[model samples]
Target chain A: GSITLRGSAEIVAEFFSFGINSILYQRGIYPSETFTRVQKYGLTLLVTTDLELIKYLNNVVEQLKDWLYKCSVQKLVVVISNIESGEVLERWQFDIECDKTSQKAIQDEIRSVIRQITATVTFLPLLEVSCSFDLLIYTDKDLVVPEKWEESGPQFITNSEEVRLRSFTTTIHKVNSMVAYKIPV
Target chain B: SITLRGSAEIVAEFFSFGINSILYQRGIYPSETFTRVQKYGLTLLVTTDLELIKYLNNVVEQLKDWLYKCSVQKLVVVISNIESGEVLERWQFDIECDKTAKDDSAPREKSQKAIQDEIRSVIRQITATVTFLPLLEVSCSFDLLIYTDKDLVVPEKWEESGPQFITNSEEVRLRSFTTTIHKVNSMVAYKIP
Candidate 1:
């Protein structure tokens, strides 16, 4: 199968859209009732039904698609933080590798990857405290920054314990994901 | 100016429950070995395993004796890998003794409720540490070390050992409690893979 460079970016950007939602639900970053079930990649996945969250995710994913198509974005991160303390508890980082002339075919691998994210809670320490999340996008050099998107520092955790997860490539874009958490001393 | 008797008993009692709480919360021992009991206005876990109950009883008795005399400086709960017994995590409770307290001296007045509340906050923090603590992938064993003034002689079954500090360890301090005569501060130190 073959696709235009623009279509390749749309594919990975969509992955971030669902992948971030799944992380929030699986990790209990937001209330369960805030999300509703939807079918995707042959699996039933949860998506946030909260209006503010819905708009926020939609806006971010929409902007991401443009950069992804332009091959300007480098990484996408979902940072789960203690709402009370503003401490970054966990960072779910997905590094993007874009091929300007690559072809596309597979979508099945993305399902397996999202499923692995669900399975991770078995060993990940519970987020018993209240937590909220923010999304960050790393770009190569967007000289003309998009409106509403501002420059920010990577809020890395101190003494973090990291666990790498699955990867999937749509031929044009390879996405590698992992989670790093702050280990309380 | 709390009485020596009251201070020693309070500190000893806190350890008896606090140690078991850490063991249960951190998944150090088989959680089945512990059962729930009410203490310090909190539902606390206590070891029910016969050998562990015996072992912990003996240590707490000695600690109380030392606490009464204001001889104990620190108490550490060292969690290690069961395979090689390598130090993995260390929970340190440092004791600051008000040395002026005597058997007949007028005791300082501190309510049990207030002190118990402080103890409750300490254990709550311990339980919350799970949000960040690395999962223990192997079976683990824990040892208790009592730090006193100097080179103290060992009791019959007890033996002297190293401080069991984890090298290059990450450290986090928790809330503390005081009986007025003895104020205790707590810190947890651990190494990550």
Candidate 2:
């Protein structure tokens, strides 16, 4: 394969990010140099099924922006794919495998995506077929404790409360809907 | 280098009975058959760890006795080793490697267990290293599980519920304080665990 983009959300989910795929690390496809170069290329566009990458990167962007100019990256485009549940991945697969000599437009589109060269190549990663697992226990940075936290108070939530704890629900958006919420230090 | 014995045991408190130590499996003098035997034998042992081999083999023994017992009287030996923490030893990756010969047996011990087994040609086996591990978490039947028990020397209340995750705190009395037991049943797919 001249250019192969094989990764899965499960794969990424398994190992923190797209770097989880053994293929990437096997041939040293994405080295430390890739991360450094991508940081240099103004901003990187991360496409995903949901806006997961955007939120994750944006938080990193906020923390690092004060010192690193690379974190100041602003240009980004997020086009919502119409079909749900891995359709775009399927389409990307078909287009990638299709004969480039016979298909000029697709070849051009591939070239266009490649020419952008924002350090890391953009491709749909493959996911592994694993049994659906639901972990019953979970803990995170944003937890709340009754003694040090308020039910709903702006200042109270921001005050330093040592270690605040709270339970989180997966589908419940309201609890974590706010992009940036104040947490008691 | 001339003579090395192969014996599988669950006596070691630190290591799982299912752990296929190359130092133990291949022994001193190497043979290609050692690898095949270890792999196949471990697989056989893992299968038996879950099922009662003697009971299952009883049916096979009866059938074989009825079918071919008159022509050639064959005595099949079914040996099983069950360590309480042995369940944690079963794993597909528990491969034995040729790590060179070393004195594994304690000097003060009455007889080197591995050497004794080899002298007797004792065909003993244990399930895969992680056989105790949940099947859901592992692809193979043998996967190891690590658990803690406070009573090896000291008696403690035994927990009945399997899922409660009993944490054994009391350390084992010695390195090899009779953690493994072996039994020989009859010939079948493999011996009981």
Question: Which candidate tops DockQ?
Answer: 1
**Tens-place lDDT digits, model 2, residues A54-142:** 35433432332221221111111121122223222111111111111134333333222332221122232222211111111111223
| Clash pairs for candidate 1 | A185-B172, B1-B107, B1-B108, B2-B108
Candidate 1 per-residue C-alpha lDDT over A1-185 given as tens digits, one digit per residue, 9 for 90 to 100: 11112236767777676667666655545544555657554444567676655665676677667766666666666666676677877767776756442221334435434544543432345455555456666665433454435544222221221211111111112234333499798
Residues B1-193, model 2: lDDT tens digits:
1212222222121122223232123211122322332321122111222243343344333323222211111222211122332221211211121223234343223344443332111122111111111112222122222223233221243232232122321111101111122112111121122
Error of 1 at B116 (Å): 0.7
Question: Candidate 1: misplaced stretches above 4 Å?
Answer: A1-185, B151-154
- What lDDT score is found at residue B106 in candidate 1? 69
lDDT of 1 by residue, B1-193 (tens): 3567777888898898988898887787787888988876556789898998898898888888888888889899999989987888899999998877774546678777667756655664464444334557688989888878664655777667888788668776655667888889887776755
lDDT of each: 0.65, 0.22
What would the DockQ be for model 2?
0.01
